[PDB]
Protein backbone atom coordinates (compact mmCIF):
# COMPACT_ATOMS: atom_id res chain seq x y z
CA UNK A 1 0.00 0.00 0.00
CA UNK A 2 3.14 2.08 0.44
CA UNK A 3 4.50 2.36 -3.10
CA UNK A 4 7.70 4.27 -2.27
CA UNK A 5 10.80 4.37 -0.08
CA UNK A 6 13.08 7.20 1.03
CA UNK A 7 16.80 6.43 0.72
CA UNK A 8 19.76 8.59 1.73
CA UNK A 9 23.39 8.61 0.61
CA UNK A 10 25.68 10.66 2.87
CA UNK A 11 29.25 11.91 3.17
CA UNK A 12 30.38 8.48 4.48
CA UNK A 13 29.70 6.79 1.15
CA UNK A 14 26.78 4.79 2.59
CA UNK A 15 23.12 4.35 1.74
CA UNK A 16 20.89 4.17 4.81
CA UNK A 17 19.44 0.86 3.71
CA UNK A 18 20.78 -2.27 2.00
CA UNK A 19 17.45 -3.98 1.31
CA UNK A 20 14.23 -2.78 -0.25
CA UNK A 21 11.14 -4.90 -0.74
CA UNK A 22 8.28 -3.92 -3.03
CA UNK A 23 4.63 -4.76 -2.39
CA UNK A 24 3.42 -6.89 -5.29
CA UNK A 25 0.08 -4.97 -5.17
CA UNK A 26 1.92 -1.80 -6.31
CA UNK A 27 1.63 -0.83 -9.99
CA UNK A 28 4.52 1.58 -9.72
CA UNK A 29 7.22 2.07 -7.16
CA UNK A 30 9.02 5.29 -6.35
CA UNK A 31 12.52 5.74 -4.95
CA UNK A 32 13.26 9.18 -3.44
CA UNK A 33 16.95 9.80 -3.03
CA UNK A 34 18.50 12.57 -0.93
CA UNK A 35 22.03 13.56 0.14
CA UNK A 36 22.40 14.99 3.60
CA UNK A 37 25.96 16.02 4.38
CA UNK A 38 28.12 18.73 2.94
CA UNK A 39 30.22 17.48 0.02
CA UNK A 40 29.47 18.54 -3.58
CA UNK A 41 28.59 16.06 -6.28
CA UNK A 42 31.97 16.19 -8.08
CA UNK A 43 33.67 14.49 -5.13
CA UNK A 44 30.88 12.67 -3.29
CA UNK A 45 27.89 12.50 -5.61
CA UNK A 46 25.49 9.57 -5.41
CA UNK A 47 22.92 8.10 -7.67
CA UNK A 48 20.54 5.14 -7.31
CA UNK A 49 20.68 2.62 -10.11
CA UNK A 50 18.69 -0.62 -10.32
CA UNK A 51 19.67 -3.68 -12.40
CA UNK A 52 19.79 -7.48 -12.42
CA UNK A 53 22.62 -9.01 -10.33
CA UNK A 54 24.12 -10.17 -13.61
CA UNK A 55 24.38 -6.63 -15.04
CA UNK A 56 25.46 -4.62 -11.97
CA UNK A 57 29.21 -4.86 -12.39
CA UNK A 58 29.08 -4.01 -16.12
CA UNK A 59 26.87 -0.99 -15.51
CA UNK A 60 29.24 0.18 -12.81
CA UNK A 61 32.29 -0.25 -15.07
CA UNK A 62 30.81 1.45 -18.16
CA UNK A 63 29.49 4.19 -15.84
CA UNK A 64 32.97 5.00 -14.56
CA UNK A 65 34.15 5.19 -18.16
CA UNK A 66 31.30 7.60 -19.01
CA UNK A 67 32.54 10.25 -16.58
CA UNK A 68 31.03 12.90 -14.32
CA UNK A 69 29.34 14.74 -17.19
CA UNK A 70 27.07 11.78 -17.89
CA UNK A 71 26.41 11.19 -14.22
CA UNK A 72 28.71 8.13 -14.36
CA UNK A 73 26.15 6.16 -16.35
CA UNK A 74 26.39 4.94 -19.94
CA UNK A 75 23.66 6.64 -21.98
CA UNK A 76 20.81 4.41 -23.20
CA UNK A 77 21.91 1.45 -21.09
CA UNK A 78 19.33 -1.30 -21.67
CA UNK A 79 20.62 -2.97 -18.45
CA UNK A 80 19.32 -0.20 -16.23
CA UNK A 81 15.81 -0.86 -15.00
CA UNK A 82 15.67 2.46 -13.23
CA UNK A 83 18.02 5.34 -12.36
CA UNK A 84 18.11 8.70 -10.62
CA UNK A 85 20.41 11.52 -11.52
CA UNK A 86 23.65 12.01 -9.70
CA UNK A 87 23.16 14.36 -6.74
CA UNK A 88 25.36 16.18 -4.27
CA UNK A 89 24.95 17.71 -0.81
CA UNK A 90 21.44 19.07 -0.14
CA UNK A 91 19.90 17.79 -3.37
CA UNK A 92 17.23 15.20 -4.08
CA UNK A 93 15.97 13.25 -7.06
CA UNK A 94 13.40 10.53 -7.56
CA UNK A 95 12.58 7.79 -9.98
CA UNK A 96 9.37 5.86 -10.55
CA UNK A 97 9.28 2.54 -12.35
CA UNK A 98 6.69 -0.07 -13.25
CA UNK A 99 6.62 -2.95 -10.79
CA UNK A 100 5.73 -5.26 -13.66
CA UNK A 101 9.38 -4.78 -14.56
CA UNK A 102 10.40 -6.97 -11.59
CA UNK A 103 10.10 -10.76 -11.82
CA UNK A 104 8.78 -12.84 -8.96
CA UNK A 105 11.46 -14.93 -7.25
CA UNK A 106 14.27 -12.80 -8.68
CA UNK A 107 16.42 -10.48 -6.54
CA UNK A 108 17.65 -7.23 -8.12
CA UNK A 109 20.62 -5.07 -7.12
CA UNK A 110 20.67 -1.35 -6.47
CA UNK A 111 23.92 0.61 -6.29
CA UNK A 112 25.65 3.88 -6.80
CA UNK A 113 27.94 4.23 -9.89
CA UNK A 114 30.15 7.07 -8.63
CA UNK A 115 33.69 5.60 -8.86
CA UNK A 116 34.43 3.24 -6.01
CA UNK A 117 31.12 3.84 -4.21
CA UNK A 118 29.65 0.40 -4.98
CA UNK A 119 32.16 -0.94 -2.45
CA UNK A 120 29.56 -0.04 0.22
CA UNK A 121 26.68 1.47 -1.72
CA UNK A 122 24.89 -1.65 -2.88
CA UNK A 123 21.70 -3.39 -1.82
CA UNK A 124 19.02 -5.88 -2.73
CA UNK A 125 15.58 -5.18 -4.04
CA UNK A 126 12.86 -7.74 -4.66
CA UNK A 127 9.13 -8.24 -4.46
CA UNK A 128 7.38 -9.27 -1.22
CU1 LIG B 1 27.76 7.34 -4.41
Swiss-Prot record:
Domain of life per record: Bacteria
Domain Plastocyanin-like intervals: 2-128
Binding site for Cu cation: 46, 112, 117, 121
Keywords annotated in UniProt: Copper, Disulfide bond, Electron transport, Metal-binding, Periplasm, Signal, Transport
UniProt keyword Protein biosynthesis present: no
Disulfide bonds: 3-26
PROSITE patterns, alphabetized: COPPER_BLUE (PS00196)
Name assigned to this protein: Azurin
Species for this entry: Pseudomonas aeruginosa (strain ATCC 15692 / DSM 22644 / CIP 104116 / JCM 14847 / LMG 12228 / 1C / PRS 101 / PAO1)
Amino acid sequence: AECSVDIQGNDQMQFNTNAITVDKSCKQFTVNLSHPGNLPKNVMGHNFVLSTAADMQGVVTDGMASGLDKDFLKPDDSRVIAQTKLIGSGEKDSVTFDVSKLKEGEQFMFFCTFPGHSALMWGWLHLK
